[PDB]
Design an enzyme around this catalytic site. Structure first.
Site, PDB file in Angstrom:
ATOM      1  N   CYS A 137       0.954  -1.144  -0.035  1.00 50.33           N
ATOM      2  CA  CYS A 137       0.086   0.156   0.107  1.00 50.33           C
ATOM      3  C   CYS A 137       1.022   1.444   0.020  1.00 50.33           C
ATOM      4  O   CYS A 137       1.573   1.541   0.955  1.00 50.33           O
ATOM      5  CB  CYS A 137      -0.981   0.093   1.328  1.00 50.33           C
ATOM      6  SG  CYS A 137      -1.729   1.241   1.128  1.00 50.33           S
ATOM      7  N   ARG A 172       0.137   4.405   2.801  1.00 51.28           N
ATOM      8  CA  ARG A 172      -0.087   4.220   4.271  1.00 51.28           C
ATOM      9  C   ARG A 172       0.539   5.353   5.155  1.00 51.28           C
ATOM     10  O   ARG A 172       0.233   5.299   6.111  1.00 51.28           O
ATOM     11  CB  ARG A 172       1.046   3.238   4.650  1.00 51.28           C
ATOM     12  CG  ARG A 172       0.542   1.894   4.183  1.00 51.28           C
ATOM     13  CD  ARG A 172       1.563   0.636   4.534  1.00 51.28           C
ATOM     14  NE  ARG A 172       2.509   0.609   3.360  1.00 51.28           N
ATOM     15  CZ  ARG A 172       3.860   0.311   3.710  1.00 51.28           C
ATOM     16  NH1 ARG A 172       4.089  -0.306   4.753  1.00 51.28           N
ATOM     17  NH2 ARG A 172       4.613   0.151   2.682  1.00 51.28           N
ATOM     18  N   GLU A 226      -5.116   3.198 -10.719  1.00 52.45           N
ATOM     19  CA  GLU A 226      -5.898   1.932 -10.596  1.00 52.45           C
ATOM     20  C   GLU A 226      -6.787   2.008 -11.613  1.00 52.45           C
ATOM     21  O   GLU A 226      -7.408   0.892 -12.009  1.00 52.45           O
ATOM     22  CB  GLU A 226      -6.424   1.880  -8.934  1.00 52.45           C
ATOM     23  CG  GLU A 226      -5.536   1.904  -8.235  1.00 52.45           C
ATOM     24  CD  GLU A 226      -5.964   1.974  -6.584  1.00 52.45           C
ATOM     25  OE1 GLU A 226      -6.140   2.840  -6.089  1.00 52.45           O
ATOM     26  OE2 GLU A 226      -6.023   0.647  -6.193  1.00 52.45           O
TER      27      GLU A 226
HETATM   28  C1  HEM Z   1      -6.172   6.611   1.603  1.00 52.07           C
HETATM   29  C2  HEM Z   1      -6.157   6.141   0.305  1.00 52.07           C
HETATM   30  C3  HEM Z   1      -5.383   4.687  -0.209  1.00 52.07           C
HETATM   31  C4  HEM Z   1      -4.596   4.819  -1.251  1.00 52.07           C
HETATM   32  C5  HEM Z   1      -4.469   5.899  -2.176  1.00 52.07           C
HETATM   33  C6  HEM Z   1      -4.158   3.564  -1.478  1.00 52.07           C
HETATM   34  C7  HEM Z   1      -3.387   3.035  -2.490  1.00 52.07           C
HETATM   35  C8  HEM Z   1      -3.282   1.640  -2.781  1.00 52.07           C
HETATM   36  C9  HEM Z   1      -3.043   1.073  -3.846  1.00 52.07           C
HETATM   37  C10 HEM Z   1      -2.751   1.642  -5.219  1.00 52.07           C
HETATM   38  C11 HEM Z   1      -2.710  -0.410  -3.702  1.00 52.07           C
HETATM   39  C12 HEM Z   1      -2.207  -1.407  -4.802  1.00 52.07           C
HETATM   40  C13 HEM Z   1      -3.569  -2.214  -5.240  1.00 52.07           C
HETATM   41  C14 HEM Z   1      -3.129  -2.173  -6.913  1.00 52.07           C
HETATM   42  O1  HEM Z   1      -1.969  -2.317  -7.310  1.00 52.07           O
HETATM   43  O2  HEM Z   1      -4.169  -2.381  -7.692  1.00 52.07           O
HETATM   44  C15 HEM Z   1      -3.057  -0.494  -2.493  1.00 52.07           C
HETATM   45  C16 HEM Z   1      -3.020  -1.907  -1.786  1.00 52.07           C
HETATM   46  C17 HEM Z   1      -3.364  -1.951  -0.544  1.00 52.07           C
HETATM   47  N1  HEM Z   1      -3.931  -1.001   0.264  1.00 52.07           N
HETATM   48 FE1  HEM Z   1      -3.893   0.935   0.192  1.00 52.07          FE
HETATM   49  N2  HEM Z   1      -4.704   2.591  -0.393  1.00 52.07           N
HETATM   50  C18 HEM Z   1      -5.337   3.535   0.712  1.00 52.07           C
HETATM   51  C19 HEM Z   1      -5.842   3.143   1.695  1.00 52.07           C
HETATM   52  C20 HEM Z   1      -5.920   1.892   2.128  1.00 52.07           C
HETATM   53  C21 HEM Z   1      -6.596   1.676   3.487  1.00 52.07           C
HETATM   54  C22 HEM Z   1      -7.345   2.464   4.413  1.00 52.07           C
HETATM   55  C23 HEM Z   1      -6.090   0.180   3.808  1.00 52.07           C
HETATM   56  C24 HEM Z   1      -6.559  -0.534   4.793  1.00 52.07           C
HETATM   57  C25 HEM Z   1      -7.186   0.083   6.141  1.00 52.07           C
HETATM   58  C26 HEM Z   1      -5.296  -0.162   2.699  1.00 52.07           C
HETATM   59  C27 HEM Z   1      -4.740  -1.525   2.570  1.00 52.07           C
HETATM   60  C28 HEM Z   1      -4.175  -1.878   1.324  1.00 52.07           C
HETATM   61  C29 HEM Z   1      -3.886  -3.305   1.291  1.00 52.07           C
HETATM   62  C30 HEM Z   1      -4.043  -4.648   2.129  1.00 52.07           C
HETATM   63  C31 HEM Z   1      -3.300  -3.285   0.125  1.00 52.07           C
HETATM   64  C32 HEM Z   1      -2.668  -4.588  -0.676  1.00 52.07           C
HETATM   65  C33 HEM Z   1      -4.152  -5.541  -1.198  1.00 52.07           C
HETATM   66  C34 HEM Z   1      -3.513  -6.780  -2.119  1.00 52.07           C
HETATM   67  O3  HEM Z   1      -2.587  -7.383  -1.569  1.00 52.07           O
HETATM   68  O4  HEM Z   1      -4.213  -7.111  -2.958  1.00 52.07           O
HETATM   69  N3  HEM Z   1      -5.032   0.929   1.933  1.00 52.07           N
HETATM   70  N4  HEM Z   1      -3.199   0.535  -1.815  1.00 52.07           N
HETATM   71  N1  LIG Z   2      -6.904   3.115  -3.696  1.00 50.82           N
HETATM   72  C1  LIG Z   2      -6.965   1.686  -2.817  1.00 50.82           C
HETATM   73  C2  LIG Z   2      -6.945   1.608  -1.570  1.00 50.82           C
HETATM   74  C3  LIG Z   2      -6.984   0.414  -0.988  1.00 50.82           C
HETATM   75  C4  LIG Z   2      -6.771  -0.920  -1.526  1.00 50.82           C
HETATM   76  C5  LIG Z   2      -6.819  -2.133  -1.034  1.00 50.82           C
HETATM   77  C6  LIG Z   2      -6.591  -2.942  -1.807  1.00 50.82           C
HETATM   78  C7  LIG Z   2      -6.476  -3.089  -3.062  1.00 50.82           C
HETATM   79  C8  LIG Z   2      -6.217  -4.562  -3.892  1.00 50.82           C
HETATM   80  O1  LIG Z   2      -5.913  -4.061  -5.098  1.00 50.82           O
HETATM   81  C9  LIG Z   2      -5.654  -5.227  -6.026  1.00 50.82           C
HETATM   82  C10 LIG Z   2      -6.427  -6.711  -5.753  1.00 50.82           C
HETATM   83  C11 LIG Z   2      -6.173  -7.687  -6.731  1.00 50.82           C
HETATM   84  C12 LIG Z   2      -5.539  -7.453  -7.736  1.00 50.82           C
HETATM   85  C13 LIG Z   2      -5.080  -6.290  -8.223  1.00 50.82           C
HETATM   86  C14 LIG Z   2      -4.254  -5.910  -9.708  1.00 50.82           C
HETATM   87  N2  LIG Z   2      -3.306  -5.263  -9.656  1.00 50.82           N
HETATM   88  C15 LIG Z   2      -2.241  -6.095  -9.059  1.00 50.82           C
HETATM   89  C16 LIG Z   2      -1.060  -5.274  -8.868  1.00 50.82           C
HETATM   90  C17 LIG Z   2       0.154  -6.001  -9.427  1.00 50.82           C
HETATM   91  C18 LIG Z   2       1.495  -5.320  -9.271  1.00 50.82           C
HETATM   92  C19 LIG Z   2       2.361  -6.174  -9.529  1.00 50.82           C
HETATM   93  C20 LIG Z   2       2.297  -7.209 -10.261  1.00 50.82           C
HETATM   94  C21 LIG Z   2       1.003  -7.704 -10.419  1.00 50.82           C
HETATM   95  N3  LIG Z   2      -0.038  -7.147 -10.321  1.00 50.82           N
HETATM   96  C22 LIG Z   2      -5.183  -5.047  -7.480  1.00 50.82           C
HETATM   97  C23 LIG Z   2      -6.582  -1.795  -3.811  1.00 50.82           C
HETATM   98  C24 LIG Z   2      -6.568  -0.761  -3.211  1.00 50.82           C
HETATM   99  N4  LIG Z   2      -6.755   0.364  -3.483  1.00 50.82           N
END
Ligand code: HEM
Ligand SMILES: Nc1ccc2ccc(COc3cccc(CNCCc4ccccn4)c3)cc2n1
Ligand code: HEM
Ligand SMILES: Nc1ccc2ccc(COc3cccc(CNCCc4ccccn4)c3)cc2n1
Ligand SMILES: [Cl-]
Ligand SMILES: [Cl-]
Lengths: 361, 361
Positions: free
Chosen positions: A65, A68, A241
């Site tokens: 993330c 954070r 995204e």
């Molecule tokens: C406040 C604005 C936030 C932004 C802009 C942000 C941004 C992102 C982005 C861009 C990703 C990558 C997902 C992808 O590549 O598709 C991500 C992953 C993640 N975010 Fe954040 N996030 C935010 C808030 C949060 C919150 C509030 C939480 C939990 C309380 C959180 C927990 C996570 C987790 C667990 C992942 C990984 C999910 C996975 O492994 O699939 N995020 N975040």
């Molecule tokens: N604004 C935000 C805020 C919070 C978020 C929390 C969780 C997520 C999860 O998001 C994804 C979950 C599953 C698949 C994908 C697709 N992307 C993959 C990224 C990647 C990187 C490198 C190699 C392969 N895949 C996203 C999003 C949150 N977004």
């Protein structure tokens, strides 16, 4: 045996949490009480303070993330008291409403009763609370391919109009029920943003839209050995995204060739970098559109600038930083961010959010 | 003890190499002869066939290289016979000329005598045979910052005009000499490409250029325990190396804000994605310019398409594929390539190319 891992995770968690809360002297008496409860009952119950801080810690530890920096302002809603389908549904409705906040998005998590001893009390089937359906009938593709299996599951339960932007219903199962229930989302609660371009009036011919608030609802929150499998949370979007992945991926809405055409460039030669140019204009349009409508959104440059401040805040607090470089770099101009040019320790620290198996095929 | 690792690496290498060359029955007699030579002399000498195939194998195993489809057409020049500074210099001149090939670049490696027993016979100081000098005097920055330490070393030895595109001289040391020698590159041998844009006539106001052929000259080639520390090699550029990194990085030529200005966009707001748009136009200009001049270059989409064919060729040959995802994805629109959407085993397989310590500070 089971009890044993629980007690260990509770020691690590309570010590660390009370230390950060300045309550270190309250630690022994609380672990006494916890050691009792686990012996008596097989489990233990977090205080509102432990649950709130644990959910914030779990975000802070989320290696993938970039957002954070804001972990400590997470809005934690304690819904461990729910017992009925109607209460679950209303708590999920409330989450949408309060997280949306008329577009000024509040990072929010709603925490439902944890798994008892392996058994889920509430099992949410949605990947996000708000998401579009997807369909795949004799080579006809409609909507969001990533939603095909959940959409097919939903239509087994008696629920789509087969537009490209059908809202999936809330779908979840209560302990004791063999089948999940589903509830149509009230449209008054769902903000959507039409995608227009700041400069290119024809961009609206694509009739793209996306929803305002990504509310991830299929991850397990683990805090001190307690497994909160149902704890949907949201931030606001980072524009890539939407513009670089949801609307651009070939296995999602696959819009780049249509983007190229309405921005007036040929989509014929790799060396014209038409995919890259289309990506930039699509991502510009997304940020512009969210901003014009007053819906929170962050661009990947500002986001990485924020994440650098998170790295500096970690070091200044004497906490190790962990991170997943392959998810932290943005899919658009990654080498233009500081993230790309450094490395990150991908160690898993708890509390944290974790994947769990889908209940549908 | 030393002899022992050598003999092992030789067994693994000769078995694998002769197997790929269809010479598996010649293996025992060759390792006999090798076991003799190592006992007698402490080392062994590759055949031209082993050296050529070993260098090709080393490219094929280069986890970070997206261009490995073409590993088997590597042009190997065997210069293990050189003994003098003049011969080294002429072999490096020849490499430039034959690799450049009037712009139709030939992937070439020139292999110099290997390290004897730790002792280098030839030690090349250049990072690439053709590279620009860099200077840093009282906050005045000129040329390529990545070349500052080597440029300072060169000026200790009596060698720049302090343009932004001074060619560093060849600089290398022979066994026995305390100081390296340097030789100015003949300009007739160095193709350079002025960067113009296909659409935006003002782009030429930036007066950017880059050289035609990247000839990496500071990596160690290891084949069957023999350490070829001096073995410069080249491919052709992938356009992002130039447009997304060499000319764009803040710690390199840092041109994005000047790009933004000549393409007529404001560079004021992150949410305008001006860095991303400038990157796309700069990378378009680079590919256009190389193509217009008849100098080989590949765009990152075509390159990744080629790399997918390399992955398919590996599986079809029954070879494990190894790769470094963090270097394989391009720095421009990485999620628009298949690479981004899969994972790679980063195991190190030999023969391979390896980093070695710089001789200058
Ligand atoms: C406040 C604005 C936030 C932004 C802009 C942000 C941004 C992102 C982005 C861009 C990703 C990558 C997902 C992808 O590549 O598709 C991500 C992953 C993640 N975010 Fe954040 N996030 C935010 C808030 C949060 C919150 C509030 C939480 C939990 C309380 C959180 C927990 C996570 C987790 C667990 C992942 C990984 C999910 C996975 O492994 O699939 N995020 N975040
Ligand atoms: N604004 C935000 C805020 C919070 C978020 C929390 C969780 C997520 C999860 O998001 C994804 C979950 C599953 C698949 C994908 C697709 N992307 C993959 C990224 C990647 C990187 C490198 C190699 C392969 N895949 C996203 C999003 C949150 N977004
Ligand atoms: C034929 C055209 C070639 C292309 C287009 C190509 C492309 C690239 C690219 C883009 C990189 C990443 C460097 C960076 O991110 O800055 C790379 C790394 C590498 N390439 Fe290739 N390459 C080619 C030929 C070669 C040849 C001929 C060899 C050796 C015989 C080679 C060996 C390597 C190695 C060792 C690396 C990693 C260097 C390091 O770790 O720093 N490549 N290649
Ligand atoms: N056409 C070609 C052909 C062959 C090439 C052979 C080698 C190289 C080496 O190249 C680099 C060496 C050192 C630094 C850098 C800067 N880029 C770093 C890439 C990166 C990825 C992820 C995280 C950090 N850094 C390049 C290039 C070749 N190029
Ligand atoms: Cl999403
Ligand atoms: Cl380079």
């Amino acid at each position: 045996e089971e009890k044993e891992i629980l007690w260990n995770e509770a020691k690590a968690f309570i010590a660390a949490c009370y230390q950060e809360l300045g309550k270190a002297a309250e630690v022994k008496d609380r672990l006494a009480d916890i050691k009792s409860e686990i012996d008596l009952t097989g489990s233990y119950v977090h205080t509102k303070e432990e649950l709130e801080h644990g959910a914030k810690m779990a975000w802070r530890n989320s290696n993938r993330c970039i957002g954070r920096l804001f972990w400590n302002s997470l809005n934690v809603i304690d819904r461990r008291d729910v017992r009925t389908k109607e209460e679950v549904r209303d708590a999920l409705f409330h989450h949408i409403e309060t997280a949306t906040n008329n577009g000024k998005i509040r990072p929010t998590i709603t925490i439902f009763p944890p798994e008892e001893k392996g058994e889920k009390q509430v099992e949410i089937w949605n990947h996000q609370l708000i998401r579009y359906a997807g369909y795949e009938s004799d080579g006809e593709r409609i909507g969001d391919p990533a939603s095909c299996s959940l959409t097919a599951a939903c239509e087994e339960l008696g629920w789509g109009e087969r537009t490209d932007f059908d809202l999936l219903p809330l779908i979840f199962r209560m302990k004791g029920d063999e089948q999940p229930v589903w509830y149509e989302l009230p449209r008054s609660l769902v903000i959507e943003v039409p995608i227009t371009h700041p400069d290119i009036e024809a961009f609206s011919d694509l009739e793209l839209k996306w929803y305002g608030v990504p509310i991830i609802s299929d991850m397990k929150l683990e805090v001190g050995g307690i497994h909160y499998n149902a704890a949907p949370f949201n931030g606001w979007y980072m524009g890539t995204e939407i513009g670089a992945r949801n609307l651009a991926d070939e296995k999602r809405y696959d819009k780049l060739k249509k983007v190229a055409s309405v921005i007036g460039i040929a989509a014929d030669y790799n060396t014209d970098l038409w995919k890259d140019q289309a990506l930039v204009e699509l991502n510009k349009a997304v940020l512009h559109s969210y901003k014009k409508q007053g819906v929170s959104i962050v661009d990947h440059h500002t986001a990485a600038s924020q994440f650098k401040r998170f790295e500096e805040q970690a070091e200044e607090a004497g906490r190790k930083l962990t991170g997943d470089w392959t998810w932290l770099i943005p899919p658009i101009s990654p080498a233009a961010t500081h993230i790309f040019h450094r490395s990150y320790d991908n160690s898993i620290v708890k509390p944290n959010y974790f994947y769990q198996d889908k209940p549908y095929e």
